[PDB]
Amino acid sequence: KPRQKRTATKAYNVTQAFGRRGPEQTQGNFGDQELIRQGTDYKHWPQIAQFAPSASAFFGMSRIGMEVTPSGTWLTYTGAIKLDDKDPNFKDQVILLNKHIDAYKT
Amino acid sequence: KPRQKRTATKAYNVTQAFGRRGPEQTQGNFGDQELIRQGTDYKHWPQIAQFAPSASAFFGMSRIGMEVTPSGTWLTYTGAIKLDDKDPNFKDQVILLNKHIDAYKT
Ligand SMILES: [Cl-]
Numbered sequence: 001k002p003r004q005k006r007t008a009t010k011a012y013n014v015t016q017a018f019g020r021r022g023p024e025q026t027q028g029n030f031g032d033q034e035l036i037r038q039g040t041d042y043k044h045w046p047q048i049a050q051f052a053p054s055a056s057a058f059f060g061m062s063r064i065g066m067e068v069t070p071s072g073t074w075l076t077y078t079g080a081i082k083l084d085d086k087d088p089n090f091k092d093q094v095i096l097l098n099k100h101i102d103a104y105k106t
Numbered sequence: 107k108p109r110q111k112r113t114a115t116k117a118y119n120v121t122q123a124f125g126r127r128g129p130e131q132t133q134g135n136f137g138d139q140e141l142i143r144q145g146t147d148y149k150h151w152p153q154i155a156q157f158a159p160s161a162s163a164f165f166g167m168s169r170i171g172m173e174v175t176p177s178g179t180w181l182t183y184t185g186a187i188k189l190d191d192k193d194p195n196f197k198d199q200v201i202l203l204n205k206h207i208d209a210y211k212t
Pocket residue numbers: 040049161162
């Protein structure tokens with residue numbers, strides 16, 4: 001029920017769990033219409049999930065901060081996950097992620 | 107094993123998995139000496155892990171990008187996870203995260 005622990009599915013999709021996609025700093029930007037509708041039921045979810053960090057890696061790799069704003073107290077995070085450009089699936093992986101980044105603008 | 111899927115423990119600690127804490131863009135900044143050396147064996151690891159995102163929430167909550175540089179092709183990410191200041195453990199949660207944020211500077 002805490003937002004960060006939700007898992008979107010067709011029965012409880014990306015908008016229900018995580019809000020509409022959009023350009024504001026408080027919004028997620030990732031997902032075309034079918035990923036939004038299907039969440040982890042999406043046809044290529046495992047190929048996306050392979051880039052998501054474990055809890056240990058989330059706190060080990062990221063730059064972590066905290067911010068107390070008018071809306072509340074936030075744990076902030078930024079980081080980058082390196083793709084293997086030698087993987088024979090590398091080009092497909094780039095295509096897959098680009099299909100969903102800022103897809104709401106199309 | 108791909109870095110984002112690693113789990114640090116006493117036998118394979120945060121440094122071995124995720125590199126030394128530091129100030130640079132490629133470095134994690136989170137963890138005091140105890141957490142670094144113990145990973146998920148750390149005494150308060152569950153109280154930290156409760157803020158890590160599920161794979162679905164990682165891609166649902168974060169602002170996702172991609173960058174190509176001489177150092178590789180990168181999936182970049184940023185976001186903010188709200189704490190519940192109505193939780194009676196809220197203050198101790200803020201204290202715990204603050205203890206580990208940039209602790210390498212102390
Ligand atoms: Cl998953």
